[PDB]
Symmetry: D2
Subunit: 440 residues, 4 copies
């Protein structure tokens, strides 16, 4: 599954339809990024640039020109063909092949952008630009506007209005096309296979980073080269650190390990968290905490649908958590009073759900307290957790337990579809899986 | 093998010994780097900061103060302990534990650097600073100096002299300690195992990125989490692109695949290139080119020693290449005339050797044309190659062949030691290895 | 004559009336400007900031908030009262006295602008900002918008639209109020008195800068402390340099001197040019060139009215010039052919008229080739000139003559009023004036 | 009196003599500075650039190259001749005439500085640069060094050492040549004539700015076009503001007026303060304060010599002031106790003396508390004052009195020479001067 040229074009046209006549929208590529000295990190295209292009080169700018209500056209600035640079560093699309390949009207050399951009903006009323995202892009846009402002003797005029296109584009990204959902479904499946592998490979004495290695190999083999974020493998007390990425410790017989990891497949993020016993068997204390977190997730999965909200579902999770913690003596008092004082917060200190898409923490307006009413086409994580610090004032057997269980869902007309349920989460199914692997 | 606290301290003292009395040297940590939106790439410490600290956190500065010829001391600025930030993002060393852990005299909060740095530089004659490396560091240094310059009413004085410490530090890095060599030896072994695995796993129909996956898994399993540079897997015509990293094509029965890949182990780079038949058997045309490149490498390995140079050894390689290409009809004319016109350059367009260490293209002065006389303790790559473009005006059977074979060596008193010779390169040994794997 | 508080308020309200509901307009003060080391040039307020405030302090920002179609209010950021700073450097308005004194609703300390501005912009749809004028202002605006963009967890929202208020404000400035015209009338009178003094004081052997001294003293004595631009006193060949400001030469018996100078009175520019004989008597060659330039000005003064344009009047001047130069043998050929080839351009290389107001080259749209149709309330210069270079290929007696004669006019319903006609320009009246002064 | 080409050359050579072999010193011109919109303030050359060149154009850089201990040479970058730019804006020296005119070895176009500077610095050990003075200069220097650092493949090398030349150059500027003293003597005389004129012109009902007008006219007529700093004319309570420059009030019969003003003559500052009765007659209260300030100045003038210090002389002034204020009942207590508690500070809150030269607050090291031992050739102001605030808790008749009296002196082998004593300061001589003028 992928996103095709025709869909990138549909997105460009949908933006244009929203644009004022006599306007241009500018979308800039991500800069290349130094890792050390002359070596660079593997390139990651800007999500919004990617969303409108499917083009994975730096030094590129998409310009959408809406001349008036019927006439519009696109111009790509991108790197010129250059035999020597390409022998050294890789092939470039160039100007001749770009219009056909990407579905744009014209292509120009990025080296000419300062000579050409002001000419494209001349006489327009509005420029749509995401100011403050990249410094290099701001310099280019501001130089172009300065040329026009100062060029009245040359009969040049600057647009007087600049509009941030991000609110509108991010609203577009919040509602996935069926094709986007198919890509996310594959991302979820790939990520699930990786987490299943990790459970099946995990043994006491292995290092946390070994499970990261298994996960990343599995992503790669299905054609998801890179993770969507830095893989978290938190065993024992490390599971109480939300984004623990050192992954440097030897995994101990008797500890849990919390794995939070996701692939990036055609630009789209998977994100799964599973927590399981390193030795294949939950202790009673671990199982008692696990059951509360699992009930939280299972209830959320039942509830998520059009017409509810992350806030409303969060309210149910909080009650499940407070009740469970009271039953175990981790909290003390009256459940409703405890809820009213947000007494769960020491143990569950993050949100239940975030949007998911081209970014793992995806774009889109949440509403105050994530109160926004859910609609079909929205994609989100569901990731309840409980983290009992090694020094917490709680019954001793619970100290140093960090559990999170996370699935990715798409809201549908009939509820939600779970994209990641092909990796097990019921404790008996986790145990059976690991018992089977441990017998091989 | 690793570099210990005591060695980081020896390096700090060696720098201090080179510093003028009444001076301070400032070494800044690498900034964290955005991958997309709020996600960051996995952190890579600045090589020089790492060289003097072994400390893998951002928002840190090492200050070495040489008060005079007998008195000197160190101050680390680093992130404060912060319960909430650490629950979210990971543990911090903090100020209390830093002196003992790193072997510095004092530690201060990085948040206080602007209030404290000028006070440390006040009244000194010289500040050692690597200007133009990081913008954030330059702002900090320039602000501190401006406070002092403008603070005579407060009896403050700025050093009048700024010296770039990089020439001296990079000369230090050019000569490896025995401990550094042991770490590089392990990096070479780990990288070799990965390349051996790739040859043993490779089959027609697999994608280039699959071999990258095998390689990276093998790095990880020996505790080298990250590559030292972006892995190159160039099959067929892709082998003619020096840094081909798309690794997106299906590998064809009948093509060669060139793999250029290396781990980063305790900060140090491995870098191996091996080229081999995708189907386990060189064609005659492929073997004819391969033999020239192999002779180039084998001769270089025999020759490299104290008292020669990369330039001198390059001269021998060029003769081997020109002679071989004439014998195959790829070049035409008299060998010595061809050499005099650098007729090999279309086919071998890069250098034979670069320094290797904390960076894959490591620091240190090469001399004009890499003429510098080699001495024990220097570490370098040896990476001859021949690249025949798919449209080259040469006998047709050679078109689209790209071959590189690269080992990592350390110069010793008796010659060189080869750190990477545990992965095969003789064509008959490559074939035997792949034949054996292909029978399983 | 001045501009009162009530008029500054009328201007603020007129801008607000043009603003979208749910918007804020930001107008920043000019930075103070270094002359040398710790000394600064005398402060000049930003013209647009001045236009809306009449407030002559740095470190100030006017914020006009249009909450909706009926509710709006103003906030001034300005320097706090500070006993020590004021003992040293002068009185400050402060926050307590500002609302009454300036006619704004609220005043806040400029030191609090970064803590307060984002709160004022929060939840607005539009911010009106003149981007690229001052770097410091851009930093403030961009920081505020970044706080809001990144502050959704705090329920903050950034306006998505930024509009340059300059096109609208500069259109306001292009049409003078009767009060503005009265101030300009006084500026013109003051400037005229200064030019009359210069003619009456001028003698051979005096330096060009001496006439600058007389002019500036006369400005000062009528309460116009500073010139509106750097005074030009170009004698002999120096008169052929349009903005000659060195004013360093001894004025020679037999040469002309061209004086281009104007006061700044309550923020408004005068601008007069007069050219006259240093020794009080035009030579024949000088008088021949002078008469053409004078006819140009006199004809322009007759023609300027509502419904014509600078371009149309320029066409008449060009014909007068080409005809006159042909008659003197400076040009050769047919007048209409000469006009068609813009043959006057070597000798008259600048425009006839520019707008005049708070800036000497005042703001406002000219139209292509200054074709805009004139309307009552517009104020402009009329400044024909002829400059014959010392090496020009023309009859020898004309070489090194530079003559410009300039008046300031306001377009009225019945034509124009001449603000500067109280200093003489007819050659016989210049001579009579100087003869009289030279007898004292 | 002026500074000639030969002296600028002597200064360049003296700097070179202090420079390391294998080094270059870079001295940049001042940027042009906006007054409003497209108008600029009259150009003021950077003092240090001026000190080494006598060249009053922007877009210029002096490069002093010391190749080794015997060979050195100079290169000027400056604006190219350009017929059109010069017709518009004034003559340029250009490259052809610069070597002879300024006494430099070579001249290059400023537009070529980025193509040429790195080539001049290539292979040098040291670059002398005043970092943080001008942003544009820092960009140029840092770009050049970056080219060299990154240009080893082109056999380029950057100097590793940057030294601030300001400490050494400012020490040079602190000790005036006889020629510099002659120029300062003329500046002092010109400034004195201006202050004498102000006393002779001053009448009740005139505005403070009128005296500024008289002063500036007098500067101009002696060929000092511009003041060395913004003229202060503080009458009544305004005299208690140290740098009162509004000069906007009507001067009242019965008030004092404090005038602090100085010309700039060939780059060098005069600085005189005189305080006198607006109506020509000190009241008793005014005379009582005046006498203390005058005794302070007269004693300072007697004492200043080689071997004392500003601090030591300040101690004498403080005793005179405390004693006088006790005698008048403005202070109460024991003189020595009052001195020990710095009880004079409310009334005398600034220093007694600052260096004087190309800047009014001239460069040079003062020592802690201005303790530096005075030597011949140093030039300084002597400016005691007493300022009694309108709300001070003191006998009522003293409120709103601000008096300062300032002369400029040069330290000599036999004491000091007073450069400004040709304007009167004894109260009876002030009165007699004004009585005489008031009878005309
Ligand atoms: Cl390009
Ligand atoms: Cl910190
Ligand atoms: Cl303030
Ligand atoms: Cl130039």
């Amino acid at each position: 599954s992928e996103i095709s040229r025709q869909e990138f074009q549909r997105r460009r046209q949908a933006l244009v339809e929203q644009m004022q006549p006599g306007s241009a929208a500018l979308i800039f590529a991500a800069p290349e990024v130094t890792r050390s000295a002359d070596s660079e990190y593997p390139y990651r295209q800007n999500s919004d640039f990617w969303y409108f292009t499917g083009f994975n080169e730096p030094e590129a700018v998409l310009v959408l020109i809406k001349s008036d209500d019927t006439h519009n056209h696109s111009v790509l600035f991108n790197r010129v063909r250059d035999l020597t640079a390409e022998i050294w560093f890789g092939r470039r699309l160039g100007q001749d092949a770009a219009p056909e390949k990407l579905g744009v009207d014209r292509a120009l050399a990025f080296s000419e952008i300062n000579q050409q951009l002001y000419q494209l903006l001349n006489g327009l009323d509005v420029v749509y630009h995401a100011q403050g995202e990249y410094a290099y892009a701001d310099v280019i846009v501001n130089s172009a506007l300065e040329k026009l402002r100062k060029g009245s003797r040359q009969n040049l005029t600057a647009p007087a209005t600049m509009i941030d296109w991000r609110p509108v584009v991010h609203e577009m990204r919040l509602f996935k096309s069926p094709e986007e959902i198919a890509v996310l479904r594959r991302a979820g499946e790939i990520t699930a296979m990786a987490h299943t592998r990790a459970m099946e490979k995990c043994r006491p004495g292995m290092f946390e980073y070994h499970l990261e290695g298994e996960i990343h190999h599995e992503f790669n083999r299905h054609g998801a080269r890179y993770p969507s974020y830095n893989t978290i493998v938190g065993s024992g007390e490390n599971g109480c650190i939300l984004h623990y990425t050192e992954n440097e410790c030897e995994m101990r017989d008797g500890d849990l390990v919390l794995i939070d990891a996701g692939c990036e497949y055609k630009g789209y993020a998977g994100d799964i968290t599973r927590t399981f016993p390193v030795n294949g068997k939950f202790t009673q204390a671990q199982r008692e905490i696990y059951d509360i977190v699992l009930e939280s997730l299972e209830t959320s999965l039942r509830l998520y649908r059009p017409g509810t909200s992350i806030l409303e579902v969060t309210g149910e999770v909080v009650r499940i958590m407070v009740s469970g913690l009271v039953k175990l003596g981790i909290l003390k008092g009256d459940v409703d009073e405890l809820i009213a004082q947000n007494a769960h917060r020491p143990f569950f200190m993050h949100g239940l759900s975030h949007w998911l898409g081209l970014d793992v923490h995806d774009v889109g307006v949440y509403g105050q307290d994530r109160s926004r009413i859910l609609e079909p086409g929205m994609v989100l994580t569901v990731e309840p957790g409980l983290y009992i610090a090694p020094d917490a004032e709680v019954p001793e057997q619970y100290r140093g337990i960090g559990i999170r269980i996370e699935d990715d869902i798409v809201i549908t007309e009939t509820g939600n579809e779970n994209l990641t349920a092909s990796v097990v989460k019921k404790p008996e199914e986790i145990e059976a899986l690991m018992v089977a692997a441990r017998k091989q």
